Design a protein around this ligand. Structure first.
Ligand SMILES: [Mg+2]
Ligand SMILES: [Mg+2]
Ligand SMILES: [Mg+2]
Ligand SMILES: [Mg+2]
Ligand SMILES: [Mg+2]
Ligand SMILES: [Mg+2]
Ligand SMILES: [Mg+2]
Ligand SMILES: [Mg+2]
Ligand SMILES: [Mg+2]
Ligand SMILES: [Mg+2]
Ligand SMILES: [Mg+2]
Ligand SMILES: [Mg+2]
Ligand SMILES: [Mg+2]
Ligand SMILES: [Mg+2]
Ligand SMILES: [Mg+2]
Ligand SMILES: [Mg+2]
Ligand SMILES: [Mg+2]
Ligand SMILES: [Mg+2]
Ligand SMILES: [Mg+2]
Ligand SMILES: [Mg+2]
Ligand SMILES: [Mg+2]
Ligand SMILES: [Mg+2]
Ligand SMILES: [Mg+2]
Ligand SMILES: [Mg+2]
Ligand SMILES: [Mg+2]
Ligand SMILES: [Mg+2]
Ligand SMILES: [Mg+2]
Ligand SMILES: [Mg+2]
Ligand SMILES: [Mg+2]
Ligand SMILES: [Mg+2]
Ligand SMILES: [Mg+2]
Ligand SMILES: [Mg+2]
Ligand SMILES: [Mg+2]
Ligand SMILES: [Mg+2]
Ligand SMILES: [Mg+2]
Ligand SMILES: [Mg+2]
Ligand SMILES: [Mg+2]
Ligand SMILES: [Mg+2]
Ligand SMILES: [Mg+2]
Ligand SMILES: [Mg+2]
Ligand SMILES: [Mg+2]
Ligand SMILES: [Mg+2]
Ligand SMILES: [Mg+2]
Ligand SMILES: [Mg+2]
Ligand SMILES: [Mg+2]
Ligand SMILES: [Mg+2]
Ligand SMILES: [Mg+2]
Ligand SMILES: [Mg+2]
Ligand SMILES: [Mg+2]
Ligand SMILES: [Mg+2]
Ligand SMILES: [Mg+2]
Ligand SMILES: [Mg+2]
Ligand SMILES: [Mg+2]
Ligand SMILES: [Mg+2]
Ligand SMILES: [Mg+2]
Ligand SMILES: [Mg+2]
Ligand SMILES: [Mg+2]
Ligand SMILES: [Mg+2]
Ligand SMILES: [Mg+2]
Ligand SMILES: [Mg+2]
Ligand SMILES: [Mg+2]
Ligand SMILES: [Mg+2]
Ligand SMILES: [Mg+2]
Ligand SMILES: [Mg+2]
Ligand SMILES: [Mg+2]
Ligand SMILES: [Mg+2]
Ligand SMILES: [Mg+2]
Ligand SMILES: [Mg+2]
Ligand SMILES: [Mg+2]
Lengths: 46, 240, 393, 339, 122
RNA sequence: ACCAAAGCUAGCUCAACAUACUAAACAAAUACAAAAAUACACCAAAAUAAAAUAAAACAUUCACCUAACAUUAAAGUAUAGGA
RNA sequence: ACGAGCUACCCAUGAGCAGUUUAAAAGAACCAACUCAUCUAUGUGGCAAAAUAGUGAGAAGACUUGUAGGUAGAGGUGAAAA
RNA sequence: CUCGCACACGCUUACAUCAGUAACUAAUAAUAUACUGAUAAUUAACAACCAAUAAACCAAAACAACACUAAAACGUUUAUUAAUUACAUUGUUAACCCAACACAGGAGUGCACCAAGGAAAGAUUAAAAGAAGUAAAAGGAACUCGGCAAACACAAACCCCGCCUGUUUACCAAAAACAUCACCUCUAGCAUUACUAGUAUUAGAGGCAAUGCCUGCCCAGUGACACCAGUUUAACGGCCGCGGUAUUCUGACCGUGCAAAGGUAGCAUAAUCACUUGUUCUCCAAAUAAGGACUUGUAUGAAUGGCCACACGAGGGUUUUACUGUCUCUU
């Protein structure tokens, strides 16, 4: 019906999907972290 | 991610073990079989299909067990039976007329004279008469009962030649095996299983059958009454 | 056969050793020196770790055969939660006892005598049943694990309210969770009743025998029923670490030596978790025989002989609403043979204290058709309970 | 609504004063004035009662062969709880011949006791309801080790209008610093049995102190004067809750304040020590709306904790105090007035 | 969405997220679920006696300071072992093989307060 | 007359040389849900570049396209190309 | 490369359905909580990038729902509406 | 006038005290839970972290006495080891979360329907037009595509299509579409990750739709088995042309030719090219509407299913009372 509220917060899901461990457990996530580090991002992950 | 199977239980037990269903999905997580999922919760009762399994090797001869109760099994069409002998109890596949307090014989002896084929008894194929209705047929000696198991289904012994038994399966196919293979006699329980009428679309969902897809597919050349000849005899003996 | 282990779920086999390990006279270059894994170097093989100083929590469990009490001969132990397949038959065979349907005539007349009743027996028993089933807890529907011990304690207190005009019930005491161990040989089988029961009553004065000499003699001609397909030891725990010592629940010099009544409760909220009545009778028979055997061996000696003075014990098994009564008289200690004199056991079975209890009023078509309270009431079961309690005095 | 959960078996340092503040209870040392008009009934056998108590001690300490206890600490809960049960059972059985009401009395084992009441008002400090007057609600969830319930009420110790120079202690501080914490759940008033139970009156409670509030634990914690404070707090809270449950089962509440004092007795036992208390609920109008002109106060009589035995070993009680046994005998021989 | 610059402390998660704030552990979990505290794991403050101590947190303002001469291994050796070595060598009893009598510790695994493994916090 | 307008600096860009190239901080905590001192393991993986485009379409082909040999010429020559 | 915190479907783990009629917990009936969204009128840069009011369908089941996990684009999932 | 209290998830100080608000936030002021500054605060008993190794153990929850089928989460005991010795660590505020907002929206659970929460109106006047409501003489659908909406009514019938409950195009289509019990075809004689810890009364790929009567002929072509013949249509599919006769008009018949057979039963102007508003009767004072009958539909038709029937349907049409501002004609 009404959209726009597709984000229902949950810390467990947030950390399990975009966490440091989740990023580092795969070669592609390590590449994502390296890209963020090269750009100079303040926060590499959640 | 990759899921792990629920079948990690190395110890045989009589009490039902809880099972995790998976609707058509493989270990990867993608569907491999359609129309499965959303059924009723079930507990798995482990069945010992190797009927002739002596409790101890010190007495490897024929042994007699007593039937305690014939019960309903949600994981199979046939009814199961609890048989106790010595210090262990086992779930076996009940025959057409098994009742509580019955006696079953498990043997591995072959003689020149055929044995009077009872219903619950399990004898090697070489000791049964030539016109015997059997079930739980075993392919290789000591392998287990992979063949006939469904409710009411039974095979028919046809002829024994050269120390080798020939059976006819419910699919009307001839299967040749060694005459020392152990097979239970008689029809399997629940002979009225084919006459059950599903009252509504909800009973299928209870059983765990999701509805078929609504996509309309035009029939190809596969359809139509294919009158194919009976496939040749399936032989399991190893001819040198 | 069909193995019950799935390959993907078993412990995976170790990866194959590097090819450098198969070359004779060649030391492999591994990454053990850098204390972390690195690709390109061979996998180092390590001997099993030896924590030179032993740690209690973080050590591998010692093997069973290393225990000083380990014995080659297997002992069949019956503990509190062991189930017997052919319950009464198996218990009678294992304890060498003869089953009798009715309760002993002494207990029966003690119950039937109207001068042994409490002041307001009917009202007090109905009040106890109602309090146990509904009133004892603030919940709407109390659970069996709560109302079984409560009803047993209420009945025990009702029977203890008899002491004012039977000044002999003060010679007793109650014991909870004590270790009983009694072992015996039964046709080349080393059986052992070992564990703990629900509750026990101890008394200063021995309970007098209830079996007549004619019945004891006629017990000789009785032949115990034998069931062929099932071994007599079915349902017991086959162990190898055990002590062959008739150690009763108490130390020497106890002021209340003689057991009087065991109390077994099936206070479980699940039917599969609860005992079947047959298994319950088997358990009461086995524990009563174990207590009687321990008492007899403490009194007379360890020699296997027919007792000139029998030892009688009682047992009450309660499901919450169903009561089973046991009076077991041990007459003999030699049990290896099956031809001598057998013990006796009067078993009163399926004694319904009440058919059903409605904790809430039932309304059918806008009117209450049955009020709150126990539906159907048999005071004879409580009469038997009181007779068993008063059998000592 | 939200309410404090008062724990009778509390670890707070000075909890008796706070419980008296919450209860409007004055604590008086010593037993209440005895009704010396008693007939020469106590001809019982002190030797027999001492033998029974010693037998219970020896059975629960040395004679009982329990399962092997791997820890060497030998916790005093699993050895004193069965002792308390056996002691209560044996004493009741032996004294029921002298006191006929104990024969018909009901013995309750670890049955919960609940009481919910209001006491004063408070301005709400935080939230959207800030600045509004809200009453202070308390709930006691007690599980006495043993209870004796009787059909008829025990006689009153002092007249309902009893006046005491000692005033109820007032605390110029928030209840949150005891510390106490508010919780919201079912607020029940329970006596140990439902209202339909004919045994709506109580006789004596037995409370076993836990392993956390032991004398050695308090001495290690550097709380030497808390040894009696814990007893006082447990007695006050438990006895008040149970007497208030009796009163509200009879039908009295804040606006229907009690017409007859409700009397209860309590025995608080450590692993070794005993203490005796007597409580009389005179008023139930503890709320602010009914406490404006309410002179009645609840009274709790206390006794110094005295050891029963002394360091027993090897089925021989070394020291035995008859004062504790006589106190227990007097409490169990207290009987309702006959009419 | 949720923040990313903020610190991920124990206040920002569910009930099952109970993260420590940096305090060292003081025991383990016992049998019935309680926490068993180990006495040896709790630090014991070795506090001296300051009753007769004639020093104050501040120094006199006219008291002169000194040139900064940080203590080095060479200076420490010269102060603690050089005179003994010189005297023993002059006497002629010097034994190069045995140096344990001069304060040298060949292995740190024996003594209580080890230097390289740093067995002591402070 | 309000709104407003003007500074000359912060710093950037392109090359040369260059030590020879992941700066400083790293007391404690940091790949448990990172910054959470502390328990009997498992760890690792490679398999061609494609296409947008040009050939006025598009199928064989389409320079550079994150692989070293630089510069002056031979030379846009020999050759390769739905030639 | 990143996405199944919305949604499609599964896997675990929990939770809800009060009253009335019926030997019924019968994919029965009336009707609440609850879930959907038939028709109409407002609204159309609106309360709202899909809502409000009235009126409707189901409401012991092929039911609604919380938490967490899985299936990822030459694909997933689909009681096919591409 | 009544969506209140608490917990879980979520935000992180927005919470509390004092002080200030010219301006910044409140879509405006008053002042303040929403702005500014300073100072303080959430104290564990509730909640989180909080044993393994073998053995005895088939016997549901639904007041559970005892049962039905869909076969059902929830446990003790025994034996071997479990550092043993107060006080560990962490969550405790709020008027709050997701929707760009101090948004009439979306939000799990336990309690009661007020003992707790709040205010529709900034102040006037009472123009038009617009939204909501109440009432209305006589008539009572004459309005309109339609009785949409509304109503002091809230009843009974006839057809079409789907058997029925259910599902679908989040955001223009809820249906006659999909699914469905039932009935049929094909593919498979078998083991450690789906199917399945199953074994032809089974499991997959599909069609059509319960039930009742049936499902007619055809393997010429294309598929599929057969590796060529031959078999298969509840496989893809198909089931005649010409000459003459009926006053014109034949699908009927008589001949003839070609085919693999040449449309059987049934229904029938259909939701079925056009002709077409086919013809006739009933319904109405009047009907291209609705129903019945004829029917030749040369382009209906039998599991791409054909015919009837109960029950069901926010499905699509047609009647009868009753009801009414839909309308006469508005106030
Ligand atoms: Mg968004
Ligand atoms: Mg199945
Ligand atoms: Mg079955
Ligand atoms: Mg199908
Ligand atoms: Mg279809
Ligand atoms: Mg963000
Ligand atoms: Mg947290
Ligand atoms: Mg929280
Ligand atoms: Mg602790
Ligand atoms: Mg081009
Ligand atoms: Mg161009
Ligand atoms: Mg083009
Ligand atoms: Mg182009
Ligand atoms: Mg290219
Ligand atoms: Mg060429
Ligand atoms: Mg997911
Ligand atoms: Mg999801
Ligand atoms: Mg209902
Ligand atoms: Mg229904
Ligand atoms: Mg609406
Ligand atoms: Mg309206
Ligand atoms: Mg509604
Ligand atoms: Mg409805
Ligand atoms: Mg309906
Ligand atoms: Mg493409
Ligand atoms: Mg796709
Ligand atoms: Mg379509
Ligand atoms: Mg389309
Ligand atoms: Mg926010
Ligand atoms: Mg502020
Ligand atoms: Mg403003
Ligand atoms: Mg709060
Ligand atoms: Mg206004
Ligand atoms: Mg107007
Ligand atoms: Mg109007
Ligand atoms: Mg009106
Ligand atoms: Mg009118
Ligand atoms: Mg009209
Ligand atoms: Mg008109
Ligand atoms: Mg309408
Ligand atoms: Mg009408
Ligand atoms: Mg109508
Ligand atoms: Mg339909
Ligand atoms: Mg029907
Ligand atoms: Mg429907
Ligand atoms: Mg769906
Ligand atoms: Mg939808
Ligand atoms: Mg739509
Ligand atoms: Mg619909
Ligand atoms: Mg719609
Ligand atoms: Mg359909
Ligand atoms: Mg048919
Ligand atoms: Mg169709
Ligand atoms: Mg049909
Ligand atoms: Mg056909
Ligand atoms: Mg063909
Ligand atoms: Mg052909
Ligand atoms: Mg076609
Ligand atoms: Mg003509
Ligand atoms: Mg017709
Ligand atoms: Mg037409
Ligand atoms: Mg019309
Ligand atoms: Mg025509
Ligand atoms: Mg046609
Ligand atoms: Mg057609
Ligand atoms: Mg077809
Ligand atoms: Mg209709
Ligand atoms: Mg519809
Ligand atoms: Mg008017």
């Amino acid at each position: 019906k009404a959209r726009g509220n597709e984000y229902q917060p949950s810390n467990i899901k947030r950390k399990h999907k975009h966490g440091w461990v989740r990023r580092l457990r795969t070669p592609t996530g390590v590449q994502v972290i390296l890209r963020r580090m090269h750009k100079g991002r303040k926060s590499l992950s959640h | 991610a990759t899921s792990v199977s629920w079948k990690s239980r190395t110890k045989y037990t009589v009490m039902p073990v809880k099972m995790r269903k998976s609707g058509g999905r493989n270990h990867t997580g993608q569907i491999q079989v359609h129309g499965i999922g959303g059924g009723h919760k079930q507990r798995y009762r482990m069945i010992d299909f190797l009927r002739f399994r002596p409790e101890h090797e010190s007495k490897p001869g024929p042994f007699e067990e007593k039937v305690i109760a014939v019960r309903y099994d949600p994981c199979r069409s046939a009814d199961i039976a609890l048989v106790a002998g010595g210090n262990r109890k086992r779930w076996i596949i009940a025959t057409e007329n098994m009742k509580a307090g019955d006696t079953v014989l498990n043997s591995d002896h072959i003689g020149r004279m055929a044995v009077a084929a009872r219903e619950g008894d399990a004898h090697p194929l070489g000791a049964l008469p030539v016109g015997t209705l059997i079930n739980n047929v075993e392919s290789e000696p000591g392998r287990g009962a992979q063949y006939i198991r469904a409710a009411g289904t039974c095979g028919v012994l046809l002829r024994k030649v050269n120390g080798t038994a020939i059976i006819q399966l419910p699919s009307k196919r001839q299967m040749q095996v060694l005459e020392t293979c152990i097979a239970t006699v008689g029809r399997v329980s629940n002979v009225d299983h084919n006459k059950r009428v599903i009252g509504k679309a909800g009973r299928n969902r209870w059983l765990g059958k999701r509805p078929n897809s609504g996509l309309w597919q035009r029939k190809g050349g596969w359809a139509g009454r294919k009158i194919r000849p009976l496939p040749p005899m399936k032989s399991y003996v190893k001819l040198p | 056969a069909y193995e019950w282990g799935v390959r993907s779920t078993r412990k995976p086999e170790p990866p194959p050793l590097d090819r450098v390990y198969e070359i004779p006279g060649l030391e492999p270059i591994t990454y053990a020196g850098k204390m972390h894994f690195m690709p390109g170097l061979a996998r180092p093989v390590f001997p099993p770790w030896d924590p030179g100083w032993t740690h209690p929590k973080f050590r591998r469990l010692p093997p069973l055969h290393e225990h000083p009490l380990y014995k080659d001969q297997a002992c069949y132990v019956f503990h509190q939660r062991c189930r017997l397949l052919e319950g009464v038959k198996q218990a009678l065979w294992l304890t060498k006892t003869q089953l009798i349907e009715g309760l002993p005539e002494k207990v029966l007349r003690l119950a039937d005598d109207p001068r042994n009743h409490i002041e307001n027996q009917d009202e007090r028993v109905l009040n106890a049943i109602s309090h146990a089933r509904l009133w004892h807890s603030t919940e709407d529907i109390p659970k069996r694990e709560t109302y079984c011990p409560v009803i047993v304690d209420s009945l025990i207190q009702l029977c203890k309210s008899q002491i004012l005009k039977h000044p002999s019930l003060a010679r007793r005491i109650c014991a909870q969770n004590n270790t009983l161990s009694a072992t015996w040989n039964r046709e080349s089988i080393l059986l052992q009743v070992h564990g703990s029961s629900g509750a026990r009553l101890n008394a200063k004065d021995p309970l007098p025998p209830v079996a007549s000499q004619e019945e004891v003699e006629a017990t000789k001609n009785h032949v115990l029923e034998t069931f062929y397909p099932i071994s007599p030891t079915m349902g017991l725990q086959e162990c190898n670490v055990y002590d062959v010592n008739d150690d009763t629940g108490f130390q020497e010099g106890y002021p209340y030596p003689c057991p009087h009544t065991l109390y077994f409760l099936e206070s479980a909220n699940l039917r599969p978790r609860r005992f079947q009545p047959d298994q319950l009778r088997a358990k009461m028979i086995l524990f009563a025989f174990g207590s009687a055997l321990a008492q007899a061996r403490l009194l007379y000696g360890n020699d296997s002989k027919v007792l000139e003075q029998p030892v009688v014990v009682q047992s009450v098994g309660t499901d919450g609403r169903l009561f089973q009564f046991l009076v077991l008289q041990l007459n003999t200690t030699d049990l290896a043979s099956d031809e001598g004199v057998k013990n006796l056991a009067w078993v009163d079975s399926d004694q319904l204290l009440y058919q059903h209890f409605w904790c809430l009023p039932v309304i059918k078509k806008k009117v209450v058709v049955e009020p709150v309270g126990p539906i159907g009431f048999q005071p004879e079961t409580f009469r038997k309970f009181l007779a068993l309690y008063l059998h000592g005095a | 609504f939200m309410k404090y959960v008062v724990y009778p078996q509390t670890f707070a340092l000075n909890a008796d004063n706070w419980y008296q503040s919450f209860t409007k209870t004055v604590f008086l040392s010593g037993l209440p004035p005895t009704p010396a008009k008693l007939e020469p009934e106590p001809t019982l056998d002190i030797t027999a009662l001492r033998e029974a108590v010693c037998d219970c001690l020896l059975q629960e300490h040395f004679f009982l062969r329990r399962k092997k206890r791997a820890p060497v600490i030998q916790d005093r809960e699993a050895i004193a709880s069965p002792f308390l049960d056996q002691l209560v059972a044996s004493l009741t059985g032996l004294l029921s011949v002298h006191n006929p009401v104990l024969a018909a009395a009901a013995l309750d084992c670890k049955r919960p006791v609940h009481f919910f009441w209001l006491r004063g008002e408070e301005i709400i400090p935080r939230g959207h309801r800030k600045g509004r007057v809200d009453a202070l609600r308390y709930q006691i969830n007690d599980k006495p080790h043993n209870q004796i319930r009787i059909s008829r009420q025990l006689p009153e110790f002092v007249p309902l209008d009893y006046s005491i120079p000692i005033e109820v202690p007032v605390m110029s501080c928030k209840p949150d610093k005891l510390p106490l914490f508010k919780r919201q759940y079912e607020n029940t008033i329970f006596i140990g049995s439902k209202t339909a139970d004919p045994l709506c009156y109580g006789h004596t409670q037995f409370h076993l102190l836990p392993d956390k509030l032991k004398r050695e634990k308090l001495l290690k914690q550097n709380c030497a004067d808390q040894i009696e404070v814990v007893f006082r707090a447990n007695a006050i809270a438990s006895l008040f809750a149970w007497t208030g449950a009796q009163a509200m089962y009879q039908g009295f509440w804040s606006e229907a304040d009690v017409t007859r004092p409700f009397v209860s007795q309590g025995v608080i036992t450590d692993g070794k020590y005993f203490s005796f208390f007597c409580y009389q609920l005179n008023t139930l109008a503890l709320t602010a709306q009914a406490d404006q002109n309410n002179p009645r106060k609840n009274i709790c009589w206390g006794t110094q904790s005295k050891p029963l035995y002394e360091t027993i070993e090897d089925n021989n009680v070394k020291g035995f105090n008859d004062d504790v046994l006589l106190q227990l005998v007097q409490f169990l021989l207290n009987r309702p007035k006959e009419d | 969405g949720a923040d990313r610059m903020s610190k991920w402390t124990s206040k920002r998660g569910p009930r099952t997220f109970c993260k420590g704030r940096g305090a060292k552990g003081t025991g383990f979990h016992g049998r019935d679920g309680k926490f068993v505290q180990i006495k040896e794991m709790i630090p014991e403050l070795v506090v001296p006696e300051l009753a007769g101590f004639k020093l104050k947190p501040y120094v006199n303002y006219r008291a002169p300071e000194g040139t900064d001469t940080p203590l080095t291994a060479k200076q420490l050796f010269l102060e603690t072992a050089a005179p003994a070595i010189e005297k023993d060598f002059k006497a002629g009893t010097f034994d190069p093989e045995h140096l344990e009598k001069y304060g040298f510790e060949p292995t740190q695994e024996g003594k209580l307060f080890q230097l390289y493994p740093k067995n002591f916090p402070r």
